[PDB]
Design a protein around this nucleic acid. Structure first.
Ligand SMILES: Nc1nc2c(ncn2[C@H]2C[C@H](O)[C@@H](COP(=O)(O)OP(=O)(O)OP(=O)(O)O)O2)c(=O)[nH]1
Ligand code: SF4
Ligand SMILES: [Mg+2]
Ligand SMILES: [Mg+2]
Lengths: 186, 868
DNA sequence: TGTCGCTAAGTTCACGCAGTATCCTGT
C-alpha cells in the first residue's frame, strides 16, 4: 500500500471513526496517545508496513513544529512496539469496533472512539449532513444510534455510501469495513 | 531499756499488713562481740490527713458560698458527723495546725490553719476529691506509712536510731537474729555523731544453661564471695573479700566424668556438689540465711540474676523462699512486670547492688558487658566461655573446674569493680544527702532522690507537701561558631555550676516564684528571705566545693584522685538532677515554670557575658549555655594568663554569687561545627614550662557509632592537624598515611576487631516497630533467635557490615562478628568501610583545612572518585 | 511500675520535583 492513497481511502474507504481521526490529524498534525494507538493499529491492519508507517508518522508530526530527532527519540519506540518489533514482540491486532466502543472514553480534545457512540445526536446529524447523506438515510442512522445499535448504523452508512441495498456482512471490525469497501470499489 | 541500732533498709506492704513498717539494720551484741542483723517492726503508724477549712459555708456546691463563717469546731463537727459515719471511721484524734503551702494546686491559701486528723491505718481511706460544706480539700490521704514515719521522725538516710521500751515479738517474723517491736512512731529517735558500722557484702555469680526442650534457664553453678566487715566510712579493704562458697549442680542429662569426686577432693573441700537444682537452691538459701548478707551484689542482678533465681525457686518449688529476703512470708510476689521493683521486694531488707546500673550512673563506657567493664577499670582480660562450651563442659573434669574457676574470677572481678568505683560509700553518702532508702538509691534514677530531698526540706520547715502522683520549654543557647582552625592561644572561660548558681542568686524558690496555672514567670523580689530549694541547692554546692578544694591538696595518690573525681562528678550530677526534676512532667514537684525561669536566666546571663566580652575588644568564637571561648592574638603564655585573670575579674565583678573560672588554654584549635572541636590543652608545670594534652570534644572519633578503623584514622589525622609542623609536611604525612591505610584495608591487613560498630538499643527487640531492619535491631533479633543469653533493652550491641551477595541496601546486610567468623559465605564490606565509614569522618575533620578536599581524600584512600 | 531537663549534629528512610531510559494495550 502507498502513503498517498491513504488520503483517498480517508475520503471513501475509511469508516467514520478513522475519517474523523484522519481529519483531525491533517488539521493539527498531532494526535493524543489514544488517537495515535487507534489510527496506528488501523493503518497496520490495512497493510501499511513498518517503514511506510514510520515515514508517514515522521512526515505528519514534523509539521507540528517539533524536532525530527524528537520524533525519533520518542515516537519511534511507540511505533516499533505497535508493530511488535521490540519488548514482548507481539503482532498486536487492530482494535475491533466493540473495543473502540468500550475502550478509553474520549474527553475534551479527543477524537478517538466510535462516532456513533461517542458523538452527540446533533453532532452526528451535522456530520452525516456534511457527507451529503440523504435526509432519510441520516434519519435512519440517527434512529439506529438512538437504538444503541451503532454497528447497524455503520452498516446503514456503508449501504448508503456504497449504493448497495444490503451490506451483506456483519460489520465487526473497522478493517472489515475497509476490506469490504475496497472489494466493492476495486 | 534503750535499744540502739544502725538502720539500712525499710520494707512495707500497703495491703498485707496495714500501718506496719519494718526497719532492718544492725545492732551491737557483747556476748558475740559483734554486730548482728535485726528487724524492728514499727506498728500502729496512724494515717494522717490535713483538712483545709473553707472561708465560708458552701451549700454542698449547689447554693455556692453563703458567707457563714466556719471555725475549727465546725470542721470537727462536720468530720465527726458526716464524713466519719459515711466512710465507716470509728476513732480519730484531731488538732489545729497552722501550716504554709506552696505547690501546684489552685485557690489554696499560702498559710492557713489546717485541721489535722489521725486515724488507724486499718480503717478505710478517704478519697482524694472528698469535699464538704466546711472544707475544700483533703491532703496526705495516700501518704504511705513508710513515708509518714520517715518524714515525721526526721530520719534522713541510714543512721543510728534509739528505741525506748522495745517489746519482744510474740512469734518470729523475720529471719534475723534479733527482733524488736515498737508500739508507736514517737518511741524512735535518731542519735548523731557516731561511726557507721561495718556491713557484710556478698558478691554472687551464677552460670546457667538454657533448657533445650523447655526453652528456659536452669542454673548449673553458683559462686559467692562474702566479706564480713566491709566498711562504709573508710577506704575499701584489701584484700576485698574475706571468704567464699561455691556450689555446682550436675546437669539433669549429662553425668560427671567418673572423676568429679577425686578432682574436688584434690582441689578443696569448700565446694558443694548438688545432685539437682533443688538441692543447689536449698543450699544457697541456707548459706544466705547463715551469712545474713546486708549487700548482695552482682552483674545485671536486678535484670537477670535475681529474677532467674526467684523464677527457678518457684519452678522447682524450693521450700522456704522467704529466706531470700529477711522477712518471713509464704506468698511470693508476682514475677514479671516492668523494672525490678518486684525483684527488689522479693529480697526485702537486703540491699542489692547491680554493678551494671552503678557503672551506668557513675562512669561512661562504650559497652557495659562484663568484659568491657573489666577491661576499662581494672585493666585485665576477661575470658568468655562460648555458650556451647558450657553445655559441653561436663565432659572433662578439667574443663568443669575451668568453668568453675571462670565463675570465681568473674565474681572477683565484680567485687573489685565495686571496690574501685567506690559504689557503696558513694551510695551511702548520696543517700544521706538526699534522704531516701539506700536500696532505692542503689537502683539508679535521680527523681526519687530529689523528691525525697525536697520532701525532707519542706517537711522539716513546716510545709504541706503535695500528694504523691498516681522539647517543652526554651533551653540552652549555643552561639554561632566561626568554624575554622586557629594557631594562636584560645582561652576558654566557663561557669561553675551555672544553674544551681542562678537558683541561688535570683532566689528561684518554690515559696517565692509567684506561679499561675508557656510564659516566663517574673523574678522574685530581692527582699524575700532565702527559700527552701535555694538552701538545699546551696548545701549541695558547698559540699561539692569542699570536695573540689580537698582534691586540690598537693601530693595525692592517683587512685584517691580518681575517687575524688568520681565523687565530685556525682555531686555535680546530683545538683543538676535537682534542677532537672523541676522539669519532669511525672515528678512530685513538677514546676515547669521554675525550670523555664532557670533556663531563661541562664540564657540571659550567657548573652550578657558575651556582650561584656565583646565590649572588651576581643573576639568570641563559641559557647554552650555557660562557656565562652575568646581569641587572644598572642603567643606568650604569661600574657595569656594576665588577660585571663583580667577578664575573669571584670566578669565576676557583676555577680553576687556566680563565679567564672579559667576553664582552659588552647594552643591549637580545630572548630568544625557546633559542639564539635579538638584542641591542645596546655597544663603549666613551673618556670614557664607547659605540657600539652590532646582533648577532643564532640568529634566523630569519640562516639561508639563509628568503626575502630575510622577512629584510629581520625585520631592520627587530628594529631597531625594539631601539631606545630609546617603545612606541607602535614599534608604529605596525611597523604602517605591515608594511602597506607587504604592499602592495608584492601589487602586485609587490618584485624577483624577494628570493624565493629556499636549501638545501644532503647526498647526490646520485639517492641521496636518493624521500620526496616535498622542494623542494631536486626542483629539483636538474630542474637535472640540463637540459643544464648538474651539482649534486653539498654544494652550495647556490636555489629559488623559484611558482604554475602545480598545485593540489598547496605544497611540491611548488618551481621554479627561471631557470625562472620563462623559463616563461610560472608566477608567484610571493603567498599562500604572505605567509602561511607572513613571518607565522611576524614572529610568532616579536614573541612576547614586548606589543601584537602573530598576528592583528594577519596583518591588517596584508593576509592574511585566517580561518586565523590 | 518510675524510668532528670534541653540543644544539636548526624544516619537512614520516606517521600515531592524534575530529568533520563524501557515496556504497554489486541484478537
Ligand atoms: N537537667 C540537667 N542539666 C544539665 C545536665 N548537665 C548539664 N546540665 C546543664 C545545667 C547546668 O547548670 C549546665 C552547666 O553544665 P557544665 O557541664 O558546665 O557543669 P557545671 O556548670 O554545672 O559545673 P562545672 O562547669 O563542672 O564547674 O548544663 C544534666 O545532666 N541534667
Ligand atoms: S462501528 Fe466500527 S467502523 Fe463504524 S464508526 Fe464505529 S468503530 Fe468505526
Ligand atoms: Mg505525551
Ligand atoms: Mg560549667
Amino acid at each position: 500500500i502507498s502513503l498517498e492513497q491513504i488520503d483517498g481511502f480517508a475520503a471513501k474507504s475509511f469508516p467514520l471513526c478513522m475519517r474523523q481521526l484522519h481529519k483531525s490529524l491533517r488539521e493539527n498534525h498531532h494526535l493524543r496517545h489514544g488517537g495515535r494507538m487507534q489510527y496506528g493499529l488501523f493503518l497496520k491492519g490495512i497493510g501499511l508496513t513498518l517503514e511506510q508507517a514510520l515515514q508517514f508518522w515522521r512526515l505528519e508530526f514534523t509539521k507540528g513544529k517539533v524536532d525530527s530527532e524528537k520524533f525519533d527519540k520518542v515516537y519511534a519506540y511507540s511505533i516499533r512496539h505497535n508493530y511488535g518489533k521490540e519488548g514482548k514482540r507481539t503482532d498486536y491486532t487492530p482494535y475491533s469496533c466493540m473495543k473502540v466502543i468500550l475502550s478509553n472514553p474520549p474527553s475534551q480534545g479527543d477524537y478517538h472512539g466510535c462516532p456513533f457512540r461517542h458523538s452527540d445526536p446533533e453532532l452526528l446529524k451535522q456530520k452525516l449532513q456534511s457527507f451529503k447523506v440523504p435526509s432519510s438515510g441520516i434519519n435512519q442512522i440517527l434512529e439506529l444510534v438512538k437504538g444503541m445499535h451503532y454497528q447497524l448504523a455503520c452498516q446503514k452508512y456503508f449501504e448508503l455510501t456504497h449504493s448497495v441495498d444490503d451490506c451483506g456482512f456483519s460489520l465487526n471490525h473497522p478493517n472489515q469495513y475497509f476490506a469490504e469497501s475496497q472489494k466493492l470499489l476495486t | 531499756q534503750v535499744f540502739r541500732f544502725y538502720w539500712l533498709d525499710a520494707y512495707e506492704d500497703q495491703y498485707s499488713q496495714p500501718g506496719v513498717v519494718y526497719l532492718f539494720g544492725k545492732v551491737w551484741i557483747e556476748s558475740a562481740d559483734a554486730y548482728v542483723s535485726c528487724c524492728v517492726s514499727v506498728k500502729n503508724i496512724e494515717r494522717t490527713v490535713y483538712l483545709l477549712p473553707r472561708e465560708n459555708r458552701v451549700q454542698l456546691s449547689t447554693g455556692k458560698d453563703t458567707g457563714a463563717p466556719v471555725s475549727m469546731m465546725h470542721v470537727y463537727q462536720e468530720f465527726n458527723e458526716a464524713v466519719a459515719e459515711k466512710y465507716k471511721i470509728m476513732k480519730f484524734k484531731s488538732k489545729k495546725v497552722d501550716k504554709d503551702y506552696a505547690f501546684e494546686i489552685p485557690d489554696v491559701p499560702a498559710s492557713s490553719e489546717y485541721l489535722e486528723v489521725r486515724y488507724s491505718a486499718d480503717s478505710p481511706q478517704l478519697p482524694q476529691d472528698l469535699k464538704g460544706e466546711t472544707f475544700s480539700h483533703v491532703f496526705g490521704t495516700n501518704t504511705s506509712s513508710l513515708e509518714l514515719f520517715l518524714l515525721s521522725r526526721k530520719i534522713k538516710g541510714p543512721s543510728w536510731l534509739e528505741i525506748k521500751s522495745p517489746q519482744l515479738s510474740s512469734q518470729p517474723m523475720s529471719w534475723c537474729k534479733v527482733e524488736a517491736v515498737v508500739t508507736r512512731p514517737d518511741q524512735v529517735s535518731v542519735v548523731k555523731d557516731l561511726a557507721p558500722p561495718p556491713v557484710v557484702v556478698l558478691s554472687l555469680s551464677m552460670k546457667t544453661v538454657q533448657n533445650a526442650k523447655t526453652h528456659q534457664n536452669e542454673i548449673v553453678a553458683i559462686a559467692a564471695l562474702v566479706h564480713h566487715t566491709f566498711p562504709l566510712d573508710k577506704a575499701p579493704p584489701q584484700p576485698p573479700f574475706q571468704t567464699h562458697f561455691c556450689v555446682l549442680s550436675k546437669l539433669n542429662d549429662c553425668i560427671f566424668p567418673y572423676d568429679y569426686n577425686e578432682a574436688v577432693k584434690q582441689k578443696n573441700a569448700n565446694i558443694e556438689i548438688a545432685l539437682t537444682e533443688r538441692t543447689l537452691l536449698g543450699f544457697f538459701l541456707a548459706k544466705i540465711h547463715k551469712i545474713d548478707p546486708d549487700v548482695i551484689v552482682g552483674h545485671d542482678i536486678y535484670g537477670f540474676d535475681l529474677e532467674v533465681l526467684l523464677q527457678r525457686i518457684n519452678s522447682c518449688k524450693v521450700p522456704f523462699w522467704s529466706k531470700i529476703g529477711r522477712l518471713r512470708r509464704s506468698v511470693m510476689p508476682k514475677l514479671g512486670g516492668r523494672s525490678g521493683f518486684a525483684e527488689r521486694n522479693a529480697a526485702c531488707g537486703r540491699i542489692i547492688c547491680d554493678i551494671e546500673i552503678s557503672a551506668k550512673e557513675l562512669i561512661r563506657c562504650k559497652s557495659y558487658h562484663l568484659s568491657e567493664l573489666v577491661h576499662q577499670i581494672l585493666k585485665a582480660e576477661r575470658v568468655v566461655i562460648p555458650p556451647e562450651n558450657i553445655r559441653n563442659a561436663y565432659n572433662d573434669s578439667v574443663h568443669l573446674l575451668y568453668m568453675l574457676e571462670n565463675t570465681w574470677i568473674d565474681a572477683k572481678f565484680i567485687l573489685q569493680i565495686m571496690c574501685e568505683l567506690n559504689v557503696l560509700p558513694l551510695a551511702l553518702q548520696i543517700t544521706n544527702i538526699a534522704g531516701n532508702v539506700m536500696s532505692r538509691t542503689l537502683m539508679g534514677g535521680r527523681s526519687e532522690r530529689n523528691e525525697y530531698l525536697l520532701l525532707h526540706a519542706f517537711t522539716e520547715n513546716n510545709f504541706i507537701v503535695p500528694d504523691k502522683p498516681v522539647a517543652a520549654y526554651a533551653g540552652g543557647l549555643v552561639l554561632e561558631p566561626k568554624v575554622g582552625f586557629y594557631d594562636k592561644f584560645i582561652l576558654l572561660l566557663d561557669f561553675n555550676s551555672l544553674y544551681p548558681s542562678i537558683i541561688q542568686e535570683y532566689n528561684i524558690c518554690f515559696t517565692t516564684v509567684h506561679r499561675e496555672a508557656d510564659e516566663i514567670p517574673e523574678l522574685p523580689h530581692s527582699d524575700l528571705e532565702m527559700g527552701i530549694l535555694p538552701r538545699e541547692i546551696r548545701k549541695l554546692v558547698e559540699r561539692r566545693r569542699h570536695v573540689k578544694q580537698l582534691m586540690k591538696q598537693p601530693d595525692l595518690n592517683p587512685d584517691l584522685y580518681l575517687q575524688y573525681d568520681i565523687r565530685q562528678k556525682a555531686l555535680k550530677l546530683t545538683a543538676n538532677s535537682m534542677y532537672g526534676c523541676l522539669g519532669f512532667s511525672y515528678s512530685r514537684f513538677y514546676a515547669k515554670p521554675l525550670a523555664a525561669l532557670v533556663t531563661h536566666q541562664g540564657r540571659e546571663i550567657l548573652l550578657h557575658t558575651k556582650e561584656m566580652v565583646q565590649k572588651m575588644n576581643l573576639e568570641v568564637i563559641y559557647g554552650d549555655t555557660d562557656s565562652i571561648m575568646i581569641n587572644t592574638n598572642c603567643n606568650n603564655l604569661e600574657e595569656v594568663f594576665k588577660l585571663g585573670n583580667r577578664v575573669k575579674s571584670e566578669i565576676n565583678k557583676s555577680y553576687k554569687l556566680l563565679e567564672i573560672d579559667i576553664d582552659g588554654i588552647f594552643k591549637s584549635l580545630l572548630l568544625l561545627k557546633k559542639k564539635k572541636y579538638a584542641a591542645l590543652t596546655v597544663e603549666p608545670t613551673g618556670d614557664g614550662k607547659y605540657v600539652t594534652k590532646q582533648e577532643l570534644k564532640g568529634l566523630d572519633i569519640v562516639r561508639r557509632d563509628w568503626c575502630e578503623l575510622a577512629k584510629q584514622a581520625g585520631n592520627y589525622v587530628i594529631s597531625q592537624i594539631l601539631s606545630d609542623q609546617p603545612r606541607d609536611s602535614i599534608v604529605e604525612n596525611i597523604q602517605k598515611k591515608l594511602t597506607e591505610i587504604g592499602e592495608n584495608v584492601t589487602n586485609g591487613t587490618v584485624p577483624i576487631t577494628q570493624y565493629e560498630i556499636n549501638k545501644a538499643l532503647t526498647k526490646d527487640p520485639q517492641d521496636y516497630p518493624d521500620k526496616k531492619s535498622l542494623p542494631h535491631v536486626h542483629v539483636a533479633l538474630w542474637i535472640n533467635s540463637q540459643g544464648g543469653r538474651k539482649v534486653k533493652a539498654g544494652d550495647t550491641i556490636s555489629y559488623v557490615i559484611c558482604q554475602d551477595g545480598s545485593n540489598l541496601s547496605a544497611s540491611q546486610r548488618a551481621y554479627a562478628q561471631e557470625q562472620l567468623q563462623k559463616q563461610e559465605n560472608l566477608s567484610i564490606d571493603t567498599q562500604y568501610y572505605l567509602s561511607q565509614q572513613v571518607h565522611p569522618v576524614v572529610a568532616r575533620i579536614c573541612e576547614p583545612i586548606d589543601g584537602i578536599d573530598s576528592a583528594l581524600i577519596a583518591m588517596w584512600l584508593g576509592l574511585d572518585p566517580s561518586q565523590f
